[PDB]
Symmetry: C4
Subunit: 87 residues, 4 copies
């Protein structure tokens, strides 16, 4: 019921149901996240910006609240949002 998301070495753990909330997104679509699944470690791996992920995951956990970590530039965080396809 729980999933491990490895962002450049930083492991985040959440429930499937938390992600499955927004099925249109990369993480919420089994078809899309599959492409980042690592069978060797049974986790998803993204070679991307780490500080941005706290906010991406919180978007799901909070049921829709998307905020930019004051410590991550707007342009950088915007590219992350597009990548995770939250829009």
């Amino acid at each position: 019921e729980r999933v491990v998301i490895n962002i450049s070495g930083l492991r985040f753990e959440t429930q499937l149901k938390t992600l499955a909330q927004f099925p249109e997104t990369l993480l919420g679509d089994p078809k899309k996240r599959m492409r980042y699944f690592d069978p060797l470690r049974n986790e998803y791996f993204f070679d991307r910006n780490r500080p941005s992920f706290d906010a991406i995951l919180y978007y799901y956990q909070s049921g829709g609240r998307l905020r930019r970590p004051v410590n991550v530039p707007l342009d950088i965080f915007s590219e992350e949002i597009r990548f995770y396809e939250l829009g």
Copy 2:
């Protein structure tokens, strides 16, 4: 005597006596926190905001000092404060 608290993959460790300080809180109440306890991993697990937790734990360690992390929005942090029943 060591307590392990897993916030979305981020591991925190403190002493039982540290949490015991405030028994009327979710973490200070063994009855309340047990609902998040994972016997097979010997840790409590919360599918919640990660940056907010440094301040939640500092509250107990400092003996009552509640500070909001400049990098966590007032409303987001206020939600966490409520959930952990610090009031």
Copy 3:
């Protein structure tokens, strides 16, 4: 030649030589830091503020540069400085 310092669950790793640079401090003095040694895990455990520690450790690594993390309140960081006895 390496030592693990566990700050409330957050593991930091450094060389003995790095700490030794300042023998007058808590971590630089074998007799002082020994009180926090955890045999069962082969690491030194401190039930304290996590964000402050990045700067405490860097003070040794940099050979004497003490900077406050913009994200840690001055009064809070000051107390940490006293506890680690950097003065």
Copy 4:
């Protein structure tokens, strides 16, 4: 195909090809980074500033975007920049 980079206990993971992009840098030069490789743990280790590395690694992942973390002083980050040889 994946490399582990231990920065004072904080583990980062990325793809060799990500680092290979800039062969003239310390991390991109297999001759320069070898000095920090720990054969035993199969990771590179640097006893350095932790907060600066998100930006150092991001430099590679972004294809050349070098941004200073708002929470890390200009002089400190410039020093890390010189060490990793990104200039």
